[PDB]
Amino acid sequence: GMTTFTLDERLERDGIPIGTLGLCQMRLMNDRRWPWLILVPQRADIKEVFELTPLDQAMLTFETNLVAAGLKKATGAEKINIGALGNIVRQLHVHVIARREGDPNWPGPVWGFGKAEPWPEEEHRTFAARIMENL
Amino acid sequence: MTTFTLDERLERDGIPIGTLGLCQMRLMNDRRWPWLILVPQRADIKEVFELTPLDQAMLTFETNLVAAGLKKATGAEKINIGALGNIVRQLHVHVIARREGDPNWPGPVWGFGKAEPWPEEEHRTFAARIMENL
């Protein structure tokens, strides 16, 4: 069950915890160049989205989409990018990223682009609050 | 009836291979990675959350059905799924077969290098194989 679920150490390291939904832990990717969240469904040994039970796939869909709408509202973003890649970290996690023309590497992907710029402490606390107020 | 029309660039860049309930399926004309797009057949949708909730659930079911089928078809180590839409605003979901050693592994296919078109016979064969495995 969910209470014994272990977050992957690299997601632990690279992401700041900002809360849990029902199925998914939410983390703010520690790269302030784009407002970037990850959703980590708290099921053991899941690598592909299709490995989730049907109901968990549904839960993830709507948690993802609630967060995407919320992120867009909180940032004033032109476009959300959603991604389940996992070439690096195999534990299933869904990227939900706020984008706009002129942001770094627009219109290309955030993934693998340049060097992460970490969030100042207080600024990510304020932003986490802002996300939670907009979900 | 729908006024949905496939964006001209997705038409040009993708080779149709079939249709499910919600989504049309195209094979991105870039043989470097086995790369599909699912285009939900709903008028003027940009974000996943602009679909009705039933369509959102359907998009996930179809995306995951295709992801499972593409893995089987390709022996992929990993499937990558992306709904980006910075270049083509029309909602479409990329579903991509990956493996160690493939071009730009482990990074993204999007924006990497120059597309290598599929030979005619090869994409026909590959399309049948995807459809067999869904």
Coordinates of N, CA and C in Angstrom, one line a residue, chain A:
Chain A
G1 N 0.8 -1.2 0.0 CA 0.0 0.0 0.0 C 0.8 1.3 0.0
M2 N 0.1 2.4 0.0 CA 0.7 3.7 -0.2 C 1.6 4.2 0.9
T3 N 1.3 3.8 2.1 CA 2.0 4.2 3.3 C 3.5 3.7 3.3
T4 N 3.7 2.5 2.7 CA 5.1 2.0 2.5 C 5.8 2.3 1.2
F5 N 5.1 3.1 0.4 CA 5.7 3.5 -1.0 C 7.0 4.2 -0.8
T6 N 8.0 3.8 -1.6 CA 9.3 4.6 -1.5 C 9.6 5.4 -2.8
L7 N 9.7 6.7 -2.6 CA 10.1 7.6 -3.6 C 11.5 7.3 -4.1
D8 N 11.8 7.3 -5.4 CA 13.1 7.1 -5.9 C 14.1 8.2 -5.4
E9 N 15.3 7.8 -5.0 CA 16.2 8.7 -4.4 C 16.6 9.9 -5.3
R10 N 16.6 9.7 -6.6 CA 16.9 10.8 -7.6 C 15.8 11.8 -7.7
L11 N 14.5 11.3 -7.5 CA 13.3 12.2 -7.5 C 13.2 12.9 -6.1
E12 N 13.7 12.2 -5.1 CA 13.9 12.8 -3.7 C 14.8 14.0 -3.8
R13 N 16.0 13.7 -4.4 CA 17.0 14.7 -4.5 C 16.6 15.9 -5.4
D14 N 16.0 15.7 -6.6 CA 15.8 16.7 -7.6 C 14.5 17.5 -7.4
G15 N 13.6 17.0 -6.6 CA 12.3 17.6 -6.5 C 12.1 18.0 -5.0
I16 N 11.4 19.1 -4.8 CA 11.0 19.6 -3.5 C 9.6 19.1 -3.2
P17 N 9.3 18.5 -2.0 CA 7.9 18.0 -1.7 C 7.0 19.2 -1.6
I18 N 5.9 19.2 -2.2 CA 4.9 20.3 -2.0 C 3.5 19.8 -1.6
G19 N 3.3 18.5 -1.3 CA 2.0 17.9 -0.9 C 1.8 16.6 -1.6
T20 N 0.7 16.0 -1.2 CA 0.2 14.7 -1.8 C -1.3 14.9 -2.2
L21 N -1.7 14.3 -3.3 CA -3.1 14.3 -3.7 C -3.6 12.9 -3.2
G22 N -4.5 12.2 -3.9 CA -4.9 10.9 -3.4 C -3.9 9.8 -3.7
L23 N -3.6 9.7 -5.0 CA -2.7 8.7 -5.5 C -1.3 9.2 -5.6
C24 N -1.1 10.5 -6.0 CA 0.2 11.0 -6.4 C 0.8 11.9 -5.3
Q25 N 2.0 11.7 -5.0 CA 2.8 12.7 -4.3 C 3.2 13.8 -5.4
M26 N 3.2 15.1 -5.0 CA 3.6 16.2 -5.8 C 4.9 16.7 -5.4
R27 N 5.8 17.0 -6.4 CA 7.0 17.6 -6.1 C 7.2 18.7 -7.1
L28 N 7.9 19.8 -6.7 CA 8.3 20.9 -7.5 C 9.7 20.5 -8.0
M29 N 9.9 20.3 -9.2 CA 11.3 20.0 -9.8 C 12.1 21.3 -9.4
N30 N 13.3 21.0 -8.9 CA 14.1 22.1 -8.4 C 14.9 22.8 -9.6
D31 N 14.2 23.4 -10.5 CA 14.7 24.0 -11.6 C 13.7 25.2 -11.9
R32 N 14.1 26.4 -11.4 CA 13.2 27.5 -11.5 C 13.0 28.1 -13.0
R33 N 13.8 27.6 -13.9 CA 13.7 28.1 -15.3 C 12.4 27.9 -15.9
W34 N 11.6 26.8 -15.5 CA 10.2 26.7 -15.9 C 9.5 26.2 -14.6
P35 N 8.2 26.7 -14.4 CA 7.5 26.0 -13.3 C 7.1 24.6 -13.7
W36 N 7.7 23.7 -12.9 CA 7.8 22.3 -13.3 C 7.5 21.4 -12.1
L37 N 6.4 20.6 -12.1 CA 5.9 19.7 -11.1 C 6.1 18.3 -11.6
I38 N 6.3 17.4 -10.7 CA 6.1 16.0 -11.0 C 5.1 15.4 -10.0
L39 N 4.3 14.4 -10.6 CA 3.3 13.7 -9.9 C 3.9 12.3 -9.8
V40 N 3.9 11.7 -8.6 CA 4.5 10.3 -8.5 C 3.4 9.5 -7.8
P41 N 2.8 8.7 -8.6 CA 1.7 7.7 -8.1 C 2.4 6.8 -7.1
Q42 N 1.8 6.7 -5.9 CA 2.4 5.9 -4.8 C 2.0 4.4 -4.9
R43 N 2.4 3.8 -6.0 CA 2.3 2.4 -6.2 C 3.7 1.9 -6.4
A44 N 4.1 0.8 -5.8 CA 5.4 0.1 -5.9 C 5.6 -0.4 -7.3
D45 N 6.9 -0.3 -7.8 CA 7.4 -1.0 -9.0 C 6.6 -0.7 -10.2
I46 N 6.1 0.5 -10.4 CA 5.4 0.9 -11.6 C 6.4 1.7 -12.5
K47 N 6.5 1.3 -13.8 CA 7.4 2.0 -14.7 C 6.6 2.7 -15.9
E48 N 5.7 1.9 -16.4 CA 4.8 2.5 -17.5 C 3.5 2.8 -17.0
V49 N 2.8 3.8 -17.5 CA 1.5 4.2 -17.1 C 0.5 3.0 -17.2
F50 N 0.7 2.2 -18.3 CA -0.3 1.1 -18.5 C -0.2 0.0 -17.4
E51 N 0.9 0.0 -16.6 CA 1.0 -1.0 -15.5 C 0.1 -0.7 -14.4
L52 N -0.3 0.6 -14.2 CA -1.3 0.9 -13.2 C -2.6 0.1 -13.4
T53 N -3.3 -0.2 -12.4 CA -4.6 -0.7 -12.5 C -5.5 0.3 -13.3
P54 N -6.6 -0.1 -13.9 CA -7.5 0.8 -14.6 C -7.9 2.0 -13.7
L55 N -8.4 1.8 -12.5 CA -8.8 2.8 -11.6 C -7.7 3.8 -11.3
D56 N -6.5 3.3 -11.0 CA -5.3 4.2 -10.8 C -4.9 5.0 -12.0
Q57 N -5.0 4.4 -13.2 CA -4.8 5.2 -14.4 C -5.8 6.4 -14.5
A58 N -7.1 6.1 -14.1 CA -8.1 7.2 -14.1 C -7.8 8.2 -13.0
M59 N -7.4 7.8 -11.8 CA -7.0 8.7 -10.7 C -5.9 9.6 -11.2
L60 N -4.9 8.9 -11.9 CA -3.7 9.7 -12.3 C -4.1 10.7 -13.4
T61 N -5.0 10.3 -14.3 CA -5.4 11.2 -15.4 C -6.0 12.5 -14.8
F62 N -6.9 12.4 -13.8 CA -7.6 13.5 -13.3 C -6.8 14.3 -12.3
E63 N -5.9 13.6 -11.6 CA -4.9 14.3 -10.7 C -4.0 15.1 -11.6
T64 N -3.5 14.5 -12.7 CA -2.6 15.2 -13.7 C -3.3 16.4 -14.3
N65 N -4.5 16.3 -14.7 CA -5.3 17.3 -15.4 C -5.7 18.4 -14.4
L66 N -6.1 18.0 -13.2 CA -6.4 19.0 -12.2 C -5.1 19.8 -11.9
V67 N -4.0 19.2 -11.8 CA -2.7 19.9 -11.5 C -2.3 20.8 -12.7
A68 N -2.5 20.3 -13.9 CA -2.2 21.0 -15.2 C -3.0 22.3 -15.2
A69 N -4.3 22.2 -15.0 CA -5.2 23.4 -15.0 C -4.8 24.3 -13.9
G70 N -4.5 23.8 -12.7 CA -4.1 24.6 -11.6 C -2.8 25.3 -11.8
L71 N -1.8 24.6 -12.4 CA -0.5 25.2 -12.7 C -0.6 26.3 -13.7
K72 N -1.5 26.1 -14.7 CA -1.7 27.1 -15.7 C -2.3 28.3 -15.1
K73 N -3.3 28.1 -14.3 CA -4.0 29.2 -13.6 C -2.9 30.0 -12.7
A74 N -2.2 29.3 -11.9 CA -1.2 29.9 -11.0 C -0.1 30.7 -11.7
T75 N 0.3 30.2 -12.9 CA 1.5 30.8 -13.6 C 1.1 31.8 -14.7
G76 N -0.2 31.8 -15.2 CA -0.6 32.5 -16.4 C 0.1 32.0 -17.6
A77 N 0.5 30.7 -17.6 CA 1.2 30.1 -18.7 C 0.4 30.0 -20.0
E78 N 1.1 30.2 -21.1 CA 0.4 30.0 -22.4 C 0.1 28.5 -22.7
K79 N 0.9 27.6 -22.3 CA 0.8 26.2 -22.6 C 1.4 25.3 -21.5
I80 N 0.7 24.2 -21.2 CA 1.2 23.2 -20.3 C 1.8 22.0 -21.2
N81 N 2.9 21.5 -20.7 CA 3.5 20.3 -21.3 C 3.4 19.2 -20.2
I82 N 2.9 18.0 -20.6 CA 2.8 16.9 -19.7 C 3.6 15.8 -20.3
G83 N 4.4 15.0 -19.4 CA 5.3 14.0 -19.9 C 5.6 12.9 -19.0
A84 N 5.6 11.7 -19.5 CA 5.9 10.5 -18.7 C 7.0 9.9 -19.5
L85 N 8.2 10.0 -19.1 CA 9.4 9.6 -19.9 C 10.0 8.4 -19.2
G86 N 10.8 8.6 -18.1 CA 11.4 7.6 -17.3 C 12.5 6.8 -18.0
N87 N 13.3 7.5 -18.8 CA 14.5 6.8 -19.4 C 15.6 6.9 -18.2
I88 N 15.5 7.9 -17.4 CA 16.5 8.2 -16.3 C 16.0 7.4 -15.1
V89 N 15.0 7.9 -14.5 CA 14.4 7.4 -13.3 C 13.2 6.5 -13.7
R90 N 13.2 5.2 -13.5 CA 12.2 4.3 -14.0 C 10.9 4.3 -13.2
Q91 N 10.9 4.6 -11.9 CA 9.7 4.8 -11.2 C 8.8 5.9 -11.9
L92 N 7.6 5.5 -12.1 CA 6.6 6.3 -12.8 C 6.5 7.7 -12.2
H93 N 6.7 8.7 -13.0 CA 6.4 10.1 -12.6 C 6.0 10.9 -13.8
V94 N 5.1 11.8 -13.6 CA 4.5 12.5 -14.7 C 4.9 14.0 -14.5
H95 N 5.6 14.5 -15.5 CA 6.0 15.9 -15.5 C 4.8 16.7 -15.9
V96 N 4.6 17.9 -15.3 CA 3.6 18.8 -15.6 C 4.2 20.2 -15.5
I97 N 4.4 20.8 -16.7 CA 5.4 21.9 -16.8 C 4.6 23.1 -17.5
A98 N 4.8 24.3 -16.9 CA 4.2 25.5 -17.4 C 5.1 26.2 -18.4
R99 N 4.6 26.5 -19.6 CA 5.4 27.1 -20.7 C 4.8 28.4 -21.3
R100 N 5.7 29.1 -21.9 CA 5.3 30.3 -22.7 C 6.4 30.6 -23.7
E101 N 6.0 31.2 -24.8 CA 6.9 31.7 -25.8 C 8.0 32.6 -25.1
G102 N 9.2 32.4 -25.5 CA 10.3 33.1 -25.0 C 10.9 32.5 -23.7
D103 N 10.3 31.4 -23.2 CA 10.9 30.8 -22.0 C 12.1 30.0 -22.4
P104 N 12.9 29.4 -21.5 CA 14.1 28.8 -22.0 C 13.9 27.6 -22.9
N105 N 14.5 27.7 -24.0 CA 14.4 26.7 -25.1 C 13.1 26.6 -25.8
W106 N 12.2 27.5 -25.6 CA 10.9 27.5 -26.3 C 11.2 27.5 -27.8
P107 N 10.5 26.7 -28.6 CA 9.4 25.8 -28.3 C 9.8 24.4 -27.9
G108 N 11.1 24.1 -27.7 CA 11.6 22.8 -27.5 C 11.3 22.2 -26.1
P109 N 11.7 21.0 -25.8 CA 11.5 20.4 -24.5 C 12.4 21.0 -23.4
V110 N 11.9 21.0 -22.1 CA 12.7 21.3 -21.0 C 13.7 20.3 -20.7
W111 N 13.4 19.0 -21.0 CA 14.2 17.8 -20.6 C 15.5 17.8 -21.3
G112 N 16.6 17.7 -20.5 CA 17.9 17.7 -21.0 C 18.5 19.0 -21.5
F113 N 17.7 20.1 -21.3 CA 18.2 21.4 -21.7 C 19.0 22.2 -20.6
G114 N 20.2 22.4 -20.9 CA 21.1 23.3 -20.0 C 21.2 22.7 -18.6
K115 N 21.5 23.7 -17.7 CA 21.8 23.4 -16.3 C 20.6 23.9 -15.4
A116 N 20.2 23.1 -14.4 CA 19.1 23.5 -13.5 C 19.6 24.7 -12.7
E117 N 18.6 25.7 -12.6 CA 18.8 26.8 -11.7 C 17.9 26.6 -10.4
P118 N 18.5 26.3 -9.3 CA 17.6 25.9 -8.1 C 16.7 27.1 -7.6
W119 N 15.6 26.7 -7.0 CA 14.7 27.7 -6.5 C 15.2 28.3 -5.2
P120 N 15.2 29.6 -5.1 CA 15.3 30.2 -3.7 C 14.3 29.6 -2.8
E121 N 14.7 29.4 -1.5 CA 13.9 28.8 -0.5 C 12.5 29.4 -0.4
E122 N 12.4 30.7 0.0 CA 11.2 31.3 0.2 C 10.3 31.4 -1.0
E123 N 10.9 31.7 -2.2 CA 10.2 31.7 -3.5 C 9.5 30.4 -3.8
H124 N 10.2 29.3 -3.6 CA 9.4 28.0 -3.8 C 8.4 27.7 -2.8
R125 N 8.5 28.2 -1.5 CA 7.4 28.1 -0.5 C 6.2 28.9 -1.0
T126 N 6.4 30.1 -1.5 CA 5.4 31.0 -2.0 C 4.7 30.3 -3.2
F127 N 5.5 29.9 -4.1 CA 4.9 29.2 -5.3 C 4.2 27.9 -5.0
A128 N 4.7 27.1 -4.0 CA 4.0 25.9 -3.6 C 2.6 26.3 -3.1
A129 N 2.5 27.3 -2.3 CA 1.3 27.9 -1.7 C 0.3 28.3 -2.9
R130 N 0.9 28.9 -3.9 CA 0.1 29.4 -5.0 C -0.5 28.3 -5.8
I131 N 0.3 27.2 -6.0 CA -0.2 26.1 -6.7 C -1.4 25.5 -5.9
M132 N -1.2 25.3 -4.6 CA -2.3 24.7 -3.8 C -3.6 25.5 -3.7
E133 N -3.4 26.9 -3.8 CA -4.6 27.8 -3.9 C -5.3 27.8 -5.2
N134 N -4.7 27.2 -6.2 CA -5.2 27.2 -7.6 C -5.7 25.9 -8.1
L135 N -5.3 24.8 -7.4 CA -5.8 23.5 -7.8 C -7.3 23.4 -7.7

